[PDB]
């Protein structure tokens, strides 16, 4: 009467029926009731109920019954404790904030990290290692993306844009070689795009796929040569700006990399820290721009009609630029303080920038480290054969 | 006789009566005395006293009785151990320094993180989400603060300050548009301020509130147009300097952010590390300024009458500026060593600066990380319903 | 029947025969079978099988039998748990990914960190502390390597390369003193190399040794003076480029240092993070170069025939250089944005560079820290005498 | 026979006599012998030996007996485990390298952190808080040290060194005010120094005290005015260089600070990491200086007689300066690559510098963090009254 002995995995836990009776609806509560002999495993020889569970954590569960606050035992992996409290009926959203960030850590990382010829057609878009043709087409598309990017970067150069005379417009024209190489790359990319269009299951998600969007936007300007006078000039002007995306085709290749998927998950999972960093920088930039603009006017020469003639800080927005360059410890040197007051404000800006940049960035860095370790583990670990054949219920 | 068996949560702990008798006044000490059968729960069948507590930590408490030094078991959350030793009577200020910083960690973070129409009137100052009018007034005050700040930053620009001729004073005058927008913003802010003044409970703390102080100081210069000749020029000169605070109205909006409250708590809780960083920087700056000023004179040309003509380091304070810019790895390039001795001193300055900046900043960064994790946890965790109905004493 | 009591190190673990029978082939499975009395140690008095093992981890092993997922107890060193599960028959490649990176940590670090006168001849190449002649030859080779390096660095100077007139070729010739010192150093190094050639066991690995390769490549140019007209000029031109390696002889001395061996192991063990860092930098550099080149053309003056006359960003590759200098927070200041659009892109470049540089570098830094702590431990720990005399099987 | 039951703190540990007999000379070994009933506490009723010790760690000690390798249980503070194994007789220098750096951590930090009127005379050198006169003399010496330093820094300025004509030597002379203030400060410091000389116990250590050395060296130049023609000019020239130490008197005041004592202990305890950092920087600087000097000559114009006319990298030592400025991400911009090859080498230099600077600096930073946390703990913790009255042996 009032003393009940729980036998968990061969370790006898003793407690009063009242302590079990505190938290109702849970399995131990039902144990405390007078109709428990039939309900649960029990032997009249020793008057102990037997549960075939880890005892080392049942200590902590029973502690939640005793004191009233549920904590995570720091000597067991989060998932192990999760499964134990799941069996005992304790709700997992009860743990104290002192032990919540380590408990809900692996599960946060885990959640963040998560007709006959049609297969052979689609095998050109599957993983490279999934076939030999796949690994060849992947190498070829890599070569052609690189050639496109190099053509772009060389097209913007001077050596390949000699000035010429047109009869009466004077301008610089691009070499023919570049246009020919661009045509070749467009032919290859359009062939690939048409072959991919051949098989397009769930065309809504195919259009929602950012990669295919980038491909089509990148292939639009060249194919607009036939389509393209007054509107034609504006559309060409925006067509150069569209061609600006042609470097974005490199993500098609780098998507199969692991570190980049981890980086995408890190970014999408650390929005709060990015917003925090941007707010810190905005406040710092504004405050220090105002401070330096006013400091640099103290020593202004009275003779000059303008308020500031000898200082780079002729207004506050210029202060914004200097404040960013100085807080990130970049320090180009295009504009710097030139008055003792300006120098004081500048030293404060450098130190405050180091601090308010080093506040949230370590949070973000720890997120990436955790996700990368987990992803590399899940990649390295050989595929299991589920050695444990579970017993029937 | 001399062998007493303590039954804690179904685990029998055995020890000599002397070990219990060492630390007097505590509950176990009273257990050791010969008048313990009535005082505590005890059965003559097994000669064991029964305590319904976590046994895994009673091991460590009894260890304090045995050896004489109290430690924190690194496998339980600090608050759990705190509550257990609180029950057993052990003083919490006895733990060894090896295990004090982790024990008193959550409790440090926790402490650092902590007439009919009058409600509807005050509802304009309450949280935005607390109503719909609140969220609208909040959006409107955001718009008007941003307009005030943009007017300020554009007022300091040249494009909006064209030079003019006044008849005989020559100066640049600000555009009328800016003055009109400023008047509009002042009208709105004064309306808000008067409505807030309508209801001001505990007016002493209302005046002590830094936000209301900033509001009044920011609204004083405009309203001084009517009040405002010899004293008037000085008060206008200081009025521009007062208007310098008008950018501080952005804290009124950003106070409801979480990262900023965490930053305020971090700053206020890491004063020692800030003083340490400032002392390190002062010693480094002084020492390296002297060293570089003397190094740069070794190669001074004898012909020149001045001691230093070819060096930027004409004196030591200039050295202060260079030493800050160089120790923070900023490196503007306005002044740099130009003598082999100067270059040696410069390399030492760069390395020593990296080191004495990276000494205390990680301490501060860890503080912010801990406070931010705890605050984000306490924000995310859904409000509890206190499932545990405590038993009557 | 169905209730089996395992006695591990004096702690009785109780469980059903089914739970043991789940995972077959393991020792506990064989325990569950009806032919277990003879097979294992067992007493009919208490009906318990006795195993003389750590019980605190047998809890977790039996937990793997019960639930079906094997975890690492965070309260025991990885090697201890490894040895226990090795005894019990559990495969070590079954642990959950939540507890794999800490389990397989020490073993990863450990694996990464791992005729009469012929002995006296070879004693000149052995460790310096291994003899007295060894420590003397080591000091002497240090002196001579340093003299060679100083001769090199001074040979490239102007003070030692005065212009002269040759009769009709005009050029600058190196001082004779440098050539004499070089000859002396070559004599010493060739004597050392010949003495080492005297004894060369496993000559294949001797040739595979990078140090001996560097020695021979460094000693080739001088000895080619006798060997060395049209081909002679090209071979001299490449001989200067070969002599460029003469600074690599410093690794011969620094190989006996500990931090450098740890750094070599860190590099070779963190290839993935290096590839990740290089990919991040390549994407960032490409993207930001394109963005800044296009941003800086928005404000281009229309009068100029060239597209860009007032900007340092005349093409995209120049953008590559600026993007590296700006993302590493180096910021020389040779080229910087000069247009409001350029300044926006520049601020984004600085922040994104800090982030994508601080992503993988902490992983690499943690690797080096772990390897260095382990190597310093293994160096400090005095050589053991294996106090534990193991019992015969 | 062969089965011995050890009762440690009420938990029965069972093991074979052979396992105890493995490690000889230790207490458990003596337990295993047949003459153990009299030697140790033992009851024939239960055939168990009773030890009044923590059982949770006796598990691990007995594990050392069983397997043969001693590990540290990660759930107990290092000192607790130290004291337990000290009682059991296990040598502490046996623990495995996997668990040595965490075991020997607190003890490393701890070791690193460690006639009638004569008392009133010496009370002027004792701690400021130790009296009222002490706190006053401390404030006064602070004021006078600051005045000396300000006089120094202003003496090197131009405003206070106007050029004058002496009749025939032309030079700039220092203002009289500075000399008068210097005389006053020297009078005060000499009075303090004489009063301290009054009482000088253990005069050998008084002379070995670096602070008194600095005081005497700083006070020597002024007092040499009376002592001080040909030798006089050289001694004055070195006297300015001696006066260079006058800024070192600030350590007299800052010695009572805590962060500085922690920094001194950190430096003295991290010599290996400093040597490692310096070696890394020397190799990096040498290698990259050579690489950039050779890279920048590829694009050298053939017309120029000199090898390099258009590059800042006219020789290799200049490369040393650039390599330091670039590896520390300082980047003054006085010299930077101007050739595509030079730019490649420069990008490599920036990245390699970040890496080989971030390798050992985190080790040093962790040392400082550990020492600072321990020192702040030992400072905060109130002085104990040793509640535990130990029992007589
Ligand atoms: C200026 C830079 C603009 C960046 C363009 C946006 C990045 C991008 O598009 O890359 C996404 C891929 C992931 O692509 P995916 O998720 O593996 O494949 C399907 C794509 N969906 C259908 C989800 C859209 O790859 C990534 O997630 C890597 C993130 C890039 C990190 C920067
Ligand atoms: C530290 C304590 C320093 C307090 C300084 C208070 C100065 C009060 C003097 C009032 C008027 C002084 C004056 O008229 O000028 C004297 C000099 C010259 O200053 P300037 O005439 O305005 O222009 C200097 C710029 N150059 C020459 C390079 C082009 O002035 C100077 O050159 C001194 C500039 C040095 C201040 C830079 C401090 C940077 C960090 C300080 C400590 C950081 C600790 C964290
Ligand atoms: C030059 C910059 C000068 C900074 C002005 C001082 C900062 C400030 O006033 O912001 C305070 C608010 C917190 O304000 P609050 O505590 O939530 O509301 C009541 C304010 N009392 C009554 C306590 C005064 O917000 C904060 O605490 C954020 C701290 C700002 C971090 C920089
Ligand atoms: C490392 C070991 C280096 C020790 C250097 C000892 C030099 C002793 C020579 C005494 C006199 C030499 C002399 O008269 O000048 C020779 C050159 C030129 O030096 P300068 O005439 O004074 O002016 C150079 C400045 N420019 C040309 C750029 C405008 O001198 C030079 O250009 C050499 C400057 C290179 C020193 C910079 C070292 C920076 C870091 C060193 C290692 C960092 C490791 C951490
Ligand atoms: C441009 C820099 C080019 C670097 C040259 C390559 C580094 C090198 O050769 O140093 C290697 C030595 C280790 O040499 P070791 O392994 O102790 O001795 C035998 C060498 N084997 C036979 C293995 C080849 O030392 C090291 O491992 C230190 C790695 C250097 C870190 C940079
Ligand atoms: C923040 C919000 C800022 C948004 C800026 C939007 C500008 C829209 C104005 C359109 C046209 C403005 C114009 O014609 O120029 C006005 C000025 C002058 O700009 P500029 O004529 O092109 O040349 C300036 C370069 N100097 C003078 C140094 C040689 O313009 C300027 O000087 C302003 C430059 C300031 C922008 C630098 C921002 C840097 C970081 C921003 C915040 C970082 C937060 C993280
Ligand atoms: C160029 C800089 C040259 C630095 C001078 C050397 C630093 C120094 O002298 O400060 C030492 C004091 C500690 O002094 P103390 O140990 O407390 O008192 C007695 C001094 N003994 C007898 C041990 C010599 O204070 C310190 O230990 C602080 C270390 C300074 C960190 C830089
Ligand atoms: C990445 C891949 C880049 C590979 C570059 C290979 C170049 C091979 C071309 C051989 C000959 C080219 C030539 O003659 O010059 C073409 C231009 C101009 O180069 P320059 O004539 O020698 O002088 C440029 C310096 N300015 C103009 C600023 C004064 O050349 C240039 O301006 C290009 C310089 C851009 C290289 C800087 C790369 C910086 C980091 C690269 C990636 C970092 C990733 C980590
Ligand atoms: K910089
Ligand atoms: K710069
Ligand atoms: K810089
Ligand atoms: K920097
Ligand atoms: Zn786990
Ligand atoms: Zn907790
Ligand atoms: Zn271990
Ligand atoms: Zn402890």
PDB file of N, CA and C in Angstrom, chain B residues 115-125 133 195:
ATOM      1  N   UNK B 115     -11.434  56.835 -17.678  1.00  0.00           N
ATOM      2  CA  UNK B 115     -10.810  55.566 -17.329  1.00  0.00           C
ATOM      3  C   UNK B 115     -11.329  54.440 -18.214  1.00  0.00           C
ATOM      4  N   UNK B 116     -12.520  54.647 -18.776  1.00  0.00           N
ATOM      5  CA  UNK B 116     -13.127  53.626 -19.621  1.00  0.00           C
ATOM      6  C   UNK B 116     -12.368  53.452 -20.933  1.00  0.00           C
ATOM      7  N   UNK B 117     -11.935  54.551 -21.549  1.00  0.00           N
ATOM      8  CA  UNK B 117     -11.180  54.478 -22.794  1.00  0.00           C
ATOM      9  C   UNK B 117      -9.665  54.422 -22.615  1.00  0.00           C
ATOM     10  N   UNK B 118      -9.162  54.372 -21.383  1.00  0.00           N
ATOM     11  CA  UNK B 118      -7.714  54.313 -21.191  1.00  0.00           C
ATOM     12  C   UNK B 118      -7.090  53.066 -21.810  1.00  0.00           C
ATOM     13  N   UNK B 119      -7.699  51.873 -21.739  1.00  0.00           N
ATOM     14  CA  UNK B 119      -7.090  50.722 -22.424  1.00  0.00           C
ATOM     15  C   UNK B 119      -6.993  50.916 -23.927  1.00  0.00           C
ATOM     16  N   UNK B 120      -8.031  51.458 -24.567  1.00  0.00           N
ATOM     17  CA  UNK B 120      -7.974  51.643 -26.014  1.00  0.00           C
ATOM     18  C   UNK B 120      -6.970  52.728 -26.395  1.00  0.00           C
ATOM     19  N   UNK B 121      -6.844  53.769 -25.568  1.00  0.00           N
ATOM     20  CA  UNK B 121      -5.790  54.764 -25.761  1.00  0.00           C
ATOM     21  C   UNK B 121      -4.422  54.097 -25.712  1.00  0.00           C
ATOM     22  N   UNK B 122      -4.141  53.381 -24.621  1.00  0.00           N
ATOM     23  CA  UNK B 122      -2.834  52.760 -24.454  1.00  0.00           C
ATOM     24  C   UNK B 122      -2.583  51.645 -25.460  1.00  0.00           C
ATOM     25  N   UNK B 123      -3.629  51.137 -26.111  1.00  0.00           N
ATOM     26  CA  UNK B 123      -3.461  50.084 -27.106  1.00  0.00           C
ATOM     27  C   UNK B 123      -2.668  50.544 -28.321  1.00  0.00           C
ATOM     28  N   UNK B 124      -2.438  51.847 -28.471  1.00  0.00           N
ATOM     29  CA  UNK B 124      -1.598  52.359 -29.544  1.00  0.00           C
ATOM     30  C   UNK B 124      -0.113  52.252 -29.229  1.00  0.00           C
ATOM     31  N   UNK B 125       0.252  52.008 -27.972  1.00  0.00           N
ATOM     32  CA  UNK B 125       1.641  51.802 -27.595  1.00  0.00           C
ATOM     33  C   UNK B 125       1.973  50.349 -27.291  1.00  0.00           C
ATOM     34  N   UNK B 133      -5.624  47.732 -34.840  1.00  0.00           N
ATOM     35  CA  UNK B 133      -5.203  49.124 -34.748  1.00  0.00           C
ATOM     36  C   UNK B 133      -3.742  49.232 -34.340  1.00  0.00           C
ATOM     37  N   UNK B 195      -0.909  61.861 -27.726  1.00  0.00           N
ATOM     38  CA  UNK B 195      -1.779  60.741 -27.387  1.00  0.00           C
ATOM     39  C   UNK B 195      -1.143  59.837 -26.338  1.00  0.00           C
TER      40      UNK B 195
END
